[PDB]
Symmetry: C4
Subunit: 237 residues, 4 copies
């Protein structure tokens, strides 16, 4: 309650937060430099210790932040991310070596402007889950159908549920859907177009109508809010 | 009127609807498993009977639902779909074997959240039919023109009205329209671009303007509705 | 003033307009049939005379419509289109043979629902001309630059102002812009990306912002209109 | 203060501005003509002097405009652009020879309608910088990760941070992302899809949600503005 407040003033200080951001930017520059074989041959020794130093400092920081925030730390998504991103970077030296770079997203955690962007962007998602679920069910059914219609003759694209899922996603982005998949398919299965065209219609119609519904429903609420404000004034005056 | 109500309380019960959804999810898992040759070699016998069982249960369910809803059953699109999807799965064991998977969309029929999504999405369509008709006429005219401009020299892409329709749809999605179709066409017909560019302009302009019109007209009605509410208050107070 | 009204009641009659639409649909079916070599071998004789008949009837119709509408006929875009589309089909039997199919768009001229769609869609265009002009100037400048940067070494894609225009349009649709054009270009000109990336940014930013501006400005006017209505009520009550 | 006003009436005159636009259009036509080797063989001599003449006139114009506007000239973006675009064209005769064409954008500087378009389009950008920054950080992190996951085995696409940036941008436009990059990658790295799919989801989700937020926030302000106007009337009457 006394040594506590000492470190709480540190962890909460403007300097503390600025320092950590400084390190994030430095280490971010460093991780781009470590991309050059030339650079690594000359200064790899320096950059590697600086990475260990930065992660040590970040470890101390996370530790301090937990002593200060106590339980609230692990009920906070931004610090949960800081935690797991620094924890990943702690596992001893193979894909984890690459996931270490995710600690640069810490620059989103630390900068309030960036948090508001991400929070704002994330906020459409909860209301989209049922549509996403519906779409995932749609993909699943069509992936099953495509696996068994086309998998024997086109193993790479449809031989497996996973592969059909992948290909169906490719068709959704419209990437080479016709020259690359459906025309080749139609040389064996001339009615393949009866499968993929409707698939393309549904998947594109749903995406567009999802955007239309977000905008139009947003404004419906905007209208409800100003309607109450105007009516209250009328009711009051 | 008495044995009727006995089964009506069953068919209307929370348990009845939950049970059927349970089966849909189980059978949905099962149909993904039947995709693995390995899995089928080991447990194909089990999964096949479970499919026959599920379809038997679904047959009993449809039958019960018709006795309970009487005529209203066949005037209801969700149960019409349940009907035809279960009926398909009833035809004896080849493409129908694959259409059996459509009974997984029954998970949309049974889950009210999913119905509202689909109903919502479908509701733009009635007001789009005339535009869709106009676009289909557009495709038809340009498919006729392309068949006779390019079909002799490019049979695969334009030799037939059907093939030209297909290719025109591909050009609409912009998939390989230039490297894959129009540049090859222009090596024989250097003015082919005078055909496909304007085609691309119209088809893209119409899609975008359709989205713009749905959003803007939706808000026009939103504005009309709150205008009347505010004015009525003014008129009343 | 007397024989005039006789034909005016004809030309204005519900039957007259329905008959012509009937012919348009029939001849539209016919023009799709004439696409099949098989069909032409058997019934080409019949279809060809029916085409001459239909065009004769359409010629009489246009003539009647001009006597009835007088000058107003040539000040009306829908009848101007009917005129030129029937006139094209009148030139004696080579690309004009294919333009004959454009008389099927007459089904848009004759059906009021279709006219409203087309009128509605066309109505955004006048306010877009300056943006279109700006974009065309943009294409022109970049086509000049690309012709002289890349035309010697890549004649097919940039050897000519016209070809560079074509390729630039292809890059705008994002069709094979990188694997098909810019990566090949970068093997000779490693900074080609400094040309096409910014080009892609501008062209995509302008299209999106054009859509955003149409929607948002539409609603600005919608808001101005209901604001005046509400305020007038407040002012009146 | 006296010879000053003499040239100020010139530089501000309707004729002065029209003359310069005339030259811009002429020189714009000329620069398209200089694209034809045939044309240059015959009239290249003429066009080259006309280019030197035009640039001399533009130099005099810029000089006059600076004497008239004094400091205000270099605090004005449109004239700053005129300045640098004419200055580029002044460097003696290699890429600068091509940048000379940028003086045609002077037609945007000189035509007020075009300025309003460009100003309008630019006005969304300041509020987008933080999102753009967030997206650039996103690209940077994923470019680092992709360089080290895939660069050794796929040097052309990922061997270098710059190349990975380029490829990631290509994946964002969805151009050949699967047939051209990720399927080839997956033949060596079967989990490459775990990298690029989520990358595609984020990058597409962010773009769409950025458009949704611009439209919806624009209308929020539109609603706030008319709400105050209506309420003030209610408050006043
Ligand atoms: C709303 C629900 C949507 C959820 C969709 C979930 C998508 C699951 C994709 C799993 C893909 C697995 C990857 C893959 O293809 O591996 C191959 C195995 C069989 O190949 P193999 O054994 O090597 O022969 O492939 C398989 O056999 C895997 C089959 C697993 C089926 C379980 C799917 C979850 C059930 C979804 C709920 C259905 C409700 C109707
Ligand atoms: C607004 C709606 C937007 C659309 C969202 C719904 C569309 C679903 C998109 C899913 C597309 C990605 C699926 C995919 O590519 O992987 C399939 C996996 C198994 O892959 P796998 O068997 O390992 O084979 C991959 C290729 N190979 C053979 C070379 C290794 O099998 C799976 O794991 C299936 C994963 C499905 C989960 C989808 C979750 C939605 C994302 C939020
Ligand atoms: C509720 C959402 C539903 C969405 C609708 C999507 C479902 C439609 C999928 C049907 C498309 C079939 C595409 C296709 O080509 O499948 C492959 C089969 C293979 O037989 P086939 O092509 O005749 O030749 C085999 C060649 N061989 C001997 C060398 C192997 O080819 C055929 O069997 C061709 C048979 C024509 C199928 C026509 C189906 C019309 C629509 C069916 C669904 C309507 C009820 C919803
Ligand atoms: C708003 C109206 C839009 C409706 C558009 C309907 C589109 C119809 C597509 C039918 C495509 C048939 C597939 C195909 O290409 O088969 C080949 C045959 C001839 O080939 P073949 O006999 O093997 O030599 O191809 C043909 O010869 C079929 C020709 C059938 C023409 C009938 C089209 C319906 C009339 C549309 C109303 C026109 C109003 C102006
Ligand atoms: C907002 C507007 C969105 C755009 C909607 C209008 C665009 C129309 C899209 C139609 C594109 C699909 C047409 C198509 O690919 O099939 C053409 C069929 C005959 O095909 P087919 O002769 O069997 O040849 C297919 C390829 N082959 C030779 C290898 C078998 O011939 C036909 O059956 C023509 C079907 C036209 C009906 C379109 C109905 C609109 C969908 C709602
Ligand atoms: C807002 C204004 C935008 C207007 C843009 C108009 C676009 C004009 C495209 C014309 C393309 C002609 C097609 C082509 O490439 O033919 C090749 C000839 C030279 O090749 P060749 O003589 O065979 O050697 O190519 C040429 O040499 C044709 C050069 C003609 C230049 C005239 C362009 C109109 C002036 C635009 C106003 C500029 C204002 C700054
Ligand atoms: C919201 C804004 C949307 C974007 C609108 C502005 C973008 C401009 C799009 C123009 C793209 C089409 C231009 C084009 O591909 O043709 C270029 C022509 C000369 O072509 P040409 O020299 O005959 O060569 C074509 C290929 N070849 C060698 C095999 C024959 O040279 C020309 O004639 C230039 C035509 C420019 C006029 C554009 C008018 C705007 C359309 C409204
Ligand atoms: C107002 C809107 C303006 C929009 C900006 C668009 C204008 C930028 C275009 C510059 C991009 C240049 C792309 C390019 O690779 O051009 C080709 C030249 C060719 O020389 P190079 O690539 O060095 O090698 C030639 C190879 N050889 C000997 C076998 C022929 O390659 C080079 O010369 C490379 C030189 C680097 C150019 C860097 C330009 C930075 C931006 C310049 C414009 C800024 C002022 C607006
Ligand atoms: C919000 C921040 C986003 C800013 C992103 C800036 C993107 C920088 C791209 C620079 C790409 C340089 C082009 C390139 O690949 O050249 C190769 C060299 C190494 O190759 P080499 O030396 O030939 O072996 O490649 C390199 O080694 C260059 C590495 C330079 C790293 C400096 C990046 C700026 C720091 C960004 C701030 C990070 C904050 C977390
Ligand atoms: C709403 C958000 C929209 C998305 C915006 C964020 C996405 C970032 C887009 C950047 C994509 C372009 C990057 C790029 O292609 O060049 C990478 C450069 C170095 O290139 P370089 O090493 O020369 O290699 C190019 C290919 N090569 C080997 C044949 C020469 O390395 C760099 O210089 C990196 C440049 C990053 C700056 C991005 C600034 C945002 C634009 C506003
Ligand atoms: C109704 C549709 C899909 C069809 C369906 O029925 N679900 C889905 C798409 C995503 C959801 C939006 C976002 O969540 C953001 C925001 C949340 C607010 O709370 C309410 C307003 C708004 C705009 C939501 C309305 C939108 O329409 C939802 C309900
Ligand atoms: C007018 C245009 C196309 C041009 C034309 O004239 N048709 C078409 C596109 C699809 C139609 C919309 C949807 O139906 C959904 C909804 C139905 C309501 O009832 C009225 C509002 C709303 C938004 C409709 C207005 C939209 O604008 C329609 C009339
Ligand atoms: C302002 C922008 C582009 C930027 C610029 O400054 N021009 C352009 C894009 C096309 C134009 C719209 C359409 O014409 C349809 C309609 C006409 C009405 O009369 C006014 C409203 C509306 C929505 C117009 C406003 C839109 O914003 C215009 C002015
Ligand atoms: C909030 C988002 C992104 C998420 C975030 O939090 N930033 C970004 C995207 C670009 C910005 C818009 C443009 O600047 C144009 C205009 C400027 C006005 O001043 C306010 C209104 C408007 C429409 C801005 C609101 C929009 O929403 C901003 C704040």
């Amino acid at each position: 309650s006394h040594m506590y407040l000492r470190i709480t003033n540190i962890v909460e200080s403007s300097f503390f937060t600025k320092f950590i951001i400084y390190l994030i930017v430095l280490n971010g520059i460093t991780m781009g430099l470590e991309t050059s074989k030339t650079f690594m041959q000359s200064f790899g020794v320096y950059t590697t210790l600086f990475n260990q130093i930065v992660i040590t400092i970040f470890t101390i920081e996370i530790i301090l932040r937990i002593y200060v925030h106590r339980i609230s730390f692990f009920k906070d998504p931004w610090s949960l991310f800081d935690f797991f991103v620094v924890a990943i970077s702690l596992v001893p030296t193979e894909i984890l070596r690459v996931l270490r770079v995710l600690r640069l997203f810490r620059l989103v955690t630390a900068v309030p402007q960036m948090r508001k962007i991400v929070s704002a962007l994330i906020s459409v998602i909860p209301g989209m889950l049922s549509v996403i679920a519906l779409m995932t069910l749609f993909f699943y059914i069509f992936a099953i159908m495509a696996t068994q219609l086309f998998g024997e003759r086109f193993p790479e694209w449809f031989g497996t549920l996973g592969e059909s899922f992948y290909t169906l996603f490719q068709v959704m982005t419209l990437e080479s859907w016709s020259m690359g998949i459906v025309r080749p398919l139609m040389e064996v299965y001339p009615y393949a177009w009866v499968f993929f065209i409707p698939f393309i219609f549904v998947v594109v119609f749903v995406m567009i109508n999802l955007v239309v519904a977000i905008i139009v429903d947003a404004m419906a609420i905007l209208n409800q809010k100003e309607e109450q404000h105007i009516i209250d004034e009328v009711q009051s005056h």
